[PDB]
Design a protein around this ligand. Structure first.
Ligand SMILES: [Zn+2]
Ligand SMILES: [Zn+2]
Ligand SMILES: [Zn+2]
Ligand SMILES: [Zn+2]
Lengths: 123, 121, 122, 125
């Protein structure tokens, strides 16, 4: 995994974020197991609860671009600093990357199982 | 607008739907005012209420791909027939295409304002 | 026909005061008459992750079921000033599930059936 | 709790689970939470034809917390269709954090635990 490449891509996509309500743009980029990179940015709505996270966008692109499994994900905030996925995104990411999906963190990447232990699941 | 081409693109992307819980795959394709076509398919979750609609995916792609406005959207279901967006998606689409956004229907498109009148805003 | 809209609005305004809406600054309340004669209420509950926000009308549906089920007959949604609000598209779909097309939604110009607000619904 | 009455919360969660609106999954869920004013609030899941518009039992708990007069959540039990303890989904972990904080105790068959253990390094303010 080229983490510097992922962060660069997440910063690039964050410039397109639609976040006029919070003023808090977010970019995300992930490496897929087929070797391609997908990206996403947050898209807010006037009804706050219909807002889509950057990580949600990533998962949508994973599938629209032909499917696969996520291997690694970086999310970056307004200043370029690495951000932690919200709990909804942690659950959504788990479905498409599993516990071993690597998630970037301001203090170093780590597996999703560490960030969503004992997850709700199909079992 | 080439509606036939939007419908075919919608069917094509629906093939990648992640809908193992409902078994109801959905695809959507939209023309953007910059001339791009963007696509999306539904992605369900084990926690049902975390599922994402195809139309949400379209709006994500709109912005990750540089922004713009939606001009036309076609949504298709399992039999390839045209579907109306759910209420959430009607609200989400309004933000990015306005009331004039054209929504595919079997006998011709109609504006989104007809599908979501007096819209919260 | 027997719906007391003034009373339902008053319940919505009352519950609005308990809203958790620190990010928008805009509290919303909703109240609904159920076919068992009770009034259920709900207020918006926003979240730091904006897209995890719950609308007042969603809260009404939760209360409907936690309190024993039923069907919604009429619903009023308001801001703090008591001004009537239109449910957002998500809430129109959620409300359809529990009230159907004939559920009455409060509106300045007279209540409107949900089917007028969400035609040809998914 | 260590002295929280988990059996009382579990019983209330099972009670409320009977009223779940889950015809799509056939997976009814109930949840009950102690508030810091000593009352219990409950909720059950409410699914939708558009699957992504489904509301979790724990969401319903948080709604009732506020509509019922506010407060902070102290302890929460979620139970599944068999009456056994269930882990909240990640969305619910995030929502619950807003209304109980990191020290909110979540029921777990191995011993209840703070929400921070289940959502470490949470996205927040
Ligand atoms: Zn998120
Ligand atoms: Zn939808
Ligand atoms: Zn709403
Ligand atoms: Zn949940």
């Amino acid at each position: 995994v080229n983490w510097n490449a992922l962060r660069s891509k997440a910063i690039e996509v964050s410039r397109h974020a639609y976040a006029p309500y919070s003023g808090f743009p977010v970019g995300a980029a992930a490496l897929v197991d087929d070797g391609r990179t997908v990206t996403g940015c947050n898209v807010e709505n006037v009804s706050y609860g219909l807002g889509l996270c950057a990580e949600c966008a990533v998962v949508c692109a994973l599938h629209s671009g032909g499917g696969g499994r996520l291997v690694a994900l970086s999310c970056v905030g307004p200043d370029g600093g690495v951000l932690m996925p919200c709990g909804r995104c942690r659950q959504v990411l788990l479905e498409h990357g599993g516990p071993e999906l690597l998630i970037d963190h301001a203090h170093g990447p780590r597996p999703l199982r560490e960030l969503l232990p004992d997850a709700f699941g199909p079992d």
